[PDB]
Amino acid sequence: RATYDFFMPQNLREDLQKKQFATLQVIPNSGLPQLEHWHSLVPLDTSNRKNTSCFGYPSWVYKAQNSRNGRHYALRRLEGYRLTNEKAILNVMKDWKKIKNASIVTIHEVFTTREFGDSSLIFAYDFHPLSKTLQEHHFQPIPAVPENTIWGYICQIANALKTIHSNRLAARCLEPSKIILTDINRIRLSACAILDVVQFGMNSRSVVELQQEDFVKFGKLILSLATGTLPAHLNNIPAALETLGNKYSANLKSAVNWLLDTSSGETKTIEHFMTGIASQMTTFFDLALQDNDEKLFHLAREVENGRIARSLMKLLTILERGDVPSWSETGDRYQLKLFRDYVFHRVDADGKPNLSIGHMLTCMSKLEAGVDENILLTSRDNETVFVLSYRELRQMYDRAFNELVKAS
Amino acid sequence: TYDFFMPQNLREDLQKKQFATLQVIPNSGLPQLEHWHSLVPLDTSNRKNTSCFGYPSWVYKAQNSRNGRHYALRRLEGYRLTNEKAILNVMKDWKKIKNASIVTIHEVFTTREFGDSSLIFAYDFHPLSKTLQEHHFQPAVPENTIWGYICQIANALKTIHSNRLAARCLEPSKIILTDINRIRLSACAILDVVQFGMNSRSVVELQQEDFVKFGKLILSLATGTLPAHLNNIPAALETLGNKYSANLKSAVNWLLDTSSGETKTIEHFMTGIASQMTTFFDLALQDNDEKLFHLAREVENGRIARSLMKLLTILERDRYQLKLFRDYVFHRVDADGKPNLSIGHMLTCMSKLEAGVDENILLTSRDNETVFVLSYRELRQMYDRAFNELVKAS
Ligand SMILES: Nc1ncnc2c1ncn2[C@@H]1O[C@H](COP(=O)(O)OP(=O)(O)OP(=O)(O)O)[C@@H](O)[C@H]1O
Ligand SMILES: Nc1ncnc2c1ncn2[C@@H]1O[C@H](COP(=O)(O)OP(=O)(O)OP(=O)(O)O)[C@@H](O)[C@H]1O
Ligand SMILES: [Mg+2]
Ligand SMILES: [Mg+2]
């Protein structure tokens, strides 16, 4: 079913570059204000549709830079929220600051502000650059969602619900617009604890009851992805379940049916639900580790590039210096010169220059490691040649450099 | 805890693993194979033990000749190949297998270059790996670590059993820690080849023992006794029950039990640890984020490296001005004549060069008579023109 590269970006380097670029963007002179601890606000909303569907208030999301640690965060703003009870913020925030989960966007702070020209309620989240909602990704008007992708989503939401429910809390909001893809097939709940504050007090439903609602909302989320119609527009659930049954396996239809069902005399628990998707959970555990290996591979390659870069800088500092006289032309530095030629002045038998990057990187790594491998250094007149090991070259190399450190 | 799969010092860890990968021993008695060279022994202790495969087993780090990559070679000493059909068939079945908790096998071949008839299995190479035996048997194992191992072994068994195969070998000496709390089965398909003509038991029967061997592995870690020396399973089960929760004791008992009259399947076992599997799904992903964080910080190192290498290849076959620029950046000298080695200046100048900034610098020849006022934009132009001239020649 699923591919090994399930959690793997196609081009990790560009992806990181684009995300870094998106993280640093600022608007020099915007009408947006500066908060006591936040500045350089940048809107992330593609469309400023004054919509109140999710929280009963219009909501904006800003990328902002914190003043204390200088890191970037996502600020969720509820326009027009008037603080009547400070306890709503303190109690909800006290419960959610504990939560740390790979499938939930962390909340750090909740506060009210007047800097926007009104009474606004601000929620400060982790920032995930170039994130798009499941709504934006799958429902935006122009294809069918692969079943393995849905199972991936199910396992990640299940992961979130395990942590949330175990802490005597509920994921009040499971709408597609409030679940973001922070990377390929990687989803996180983007709006936790907001409904906890908005519905504080006036709510009468208990925790367990709210948790029962999480499963229904969970089931409607899957149904939306399978049918392509948003949850709020699902008029005929039986008709949707039957659409799902024709496109997907019986296993998926059974899971969604268990999530939607409220007529059984048994209370639904995340414990029971996980037991039923154990096989899928193991598969995406595997895929996560394989992607970990992929990231470790690239990370190891770039850390070594860092080491090589510092070696190349030292090399450039040593050779052809200005100024003992002819210091770079005599003794050890002369061999270092021929080594440079061997690595960076490679030429084919025909006489054409060879610019293979691989030969160059391999040689510099062997130099740092001081490998007991021999190479043939050829003089520029080439009448004379020298056989040296990388271990020996490293010795000359370190000795030539620390002479300059002596001179300070 | 959240940092379950996260090394304490990733920097030091990667450096050591890099050194271990490139290391060679100049003159050992070890031979050169048709497609392998620079063999390096990985056996920590050279005690000749034949318990696992009935033959002494050696592991070498070797460099492939076709591709320049490093691999782990498992050598079975004194094994003479009797059936040619056995090797190919076991291979085509395991060549498919790709799993995060199993060391990939690539090739199987016989050799006489070692001074005897040896059977060689070529694996992926995981530098500075240690076995569970070396790690745990050479304090009490936290229960969280054991569930971690169980999920990874369970993961491995799902893929193996689904391919109508069995993990013949689950001993602690053939399960390696390739990183913190990260285990992989190091010896798959070896017993498949050795016992090909002799084994009469079916696939399903072999799979039932895997669960027993799995259960014996866990009991060993909880009690501190090697599987081969577990004389009293009931007493060990009671020890485990006194040190650990009832959940673990239940899992181990299910793995060991063969009296239930019910065929054990990996499907059923996975169902019973569904919650544990979810926790470690989370932990793998949080480590995913951790590695991505460091990678983002390190990603520019490649570009910086190529800029310096580019500079080194153009010079010493417009070139004159580039020479003063190199001098300006890497040959700074104090008023006394002493060399200045500030790293910040070097990085800044190469960064401005790459960016082609319109900022001007004053280049002076060592003879004070000639000077050049140039911008980094102009220097980048020459820098690029000088290079693509060499690409032309190639
Ligand atoms: N933590 C975050 N980091 C980065 N981007 C985020 C984060 N949370 C949300 N976003 C992005 O901000 C944008 C706006 O999100 P929002 O929830 O407002 O969606 P919306 O389409 O405006 O829905 P609504 O109509 O309910 O406001 C989305 O593209 C989303 O991916
Ligand atoms: N695929 C691999 N990549 C890297 N290192 C490995 C690999 N497989 C095994 N090793 C390492 O090689 C060493 C040899 O262990 P091996 O199990 O072959 O013998 P042993 O445990 O020393 O003794 P015995 O042969 O009695 O088991 C171990 O330290 C192990 O971590
Ligand atoms: Mg919005
Ligand atoms: Mg050995």
Numbering used by the authors:
A (entry chain F): 213 to 354, 363 to 543, 547 to 631
B (entry chain E): 215 to 352, 363 to 541, 555 to 631
What does the paper say about this structure?
Two conserved complexes carry out the majority of deadenylation in the cytoplasm: Pan2–Pan3 and Ccr4–Not. As illustrated in Fig1A, Pan3 contains a zinc finger at its N-terminus, a pseudokinase domain (PK), a coiled coil and a highly conserved C-terminal domain (CTD) (Brown et al, 1996; Christie et al, 2013; Wolf & Passmore, 2014). Pan2 contains three functional domains: an N-terminal WD40 domain, an inactive ubiquitin C-terminal hydrolase (UCH) domain and a C-terminal exonuclease (Fig1A) (Boeck et al, 1996; Wolf & Passmore, 2014). In conclusion, through combined biochemical and structural approaches, we have shown that Pan3 is required to couple RNA binding to the Pan2 exonuclease activity.
We obtained crystals of Se-Met-labeled ctPan3 PKC (residues 205–640) with P1 symmetry and four Pan3 homodimers in the asymmetric unit that were solved using single-wavelength anomalous dispersion (SAD) methods. The ctPan3 structure consists of an N-terminal pseudokinase domain (residues 242–497) to which MgATP is bound, a central asymmetric coiled-coil domain (residues 499–538) and a C-terminal domain (residues 555–640) (Fig5C). Although ATP was bound to both pseudokinase domains, ATP was not added to crystallization conditions and is present in all copies in the asymmetric unit of the crystal. The pseudokinase lacks almost all catalytic residues and is predicted to be inactive (Christie et al, 2013). Two distinctive beta-hairpin ‘ears’ protrude from each C-terminal domain. A kink is formed in the coiled-coil region as a result of one of the CTDs (chain B) interacting with the pseudokinase from the other chain, introducing asymmetry into the Pan3 dimer. The pseudokinase and CTD domains of C. thermophilum Pan3 are similar to the recently reported structures for Drosophila (RMSDs of 1.13 Å and 0.87 Å, respectively) and Neurospora (RMSDs of 1.24 Å and 0.93 Å, respectively) proteins (Christie et al, 2013), indicating high structural conservation of Pan3. The principal difference between these structures is that the kink in the coiled coil of ctPan3 is more pronounced, resulting in twists of approximately 28° and 31°, respectively, of the CTD relative to the pseudokinase domain. Second, the highly conserved Pan3 pseudokinase/C-terminal domain also binds RNA but in a manner that is not specific for polyA (Fig4). This region has a theoretical pI of approximately 8.8, and examination of the surface potential reveals a substantial positive charge that could mediate electrostatic interactions with negatively charged RNA backbone phosphates.
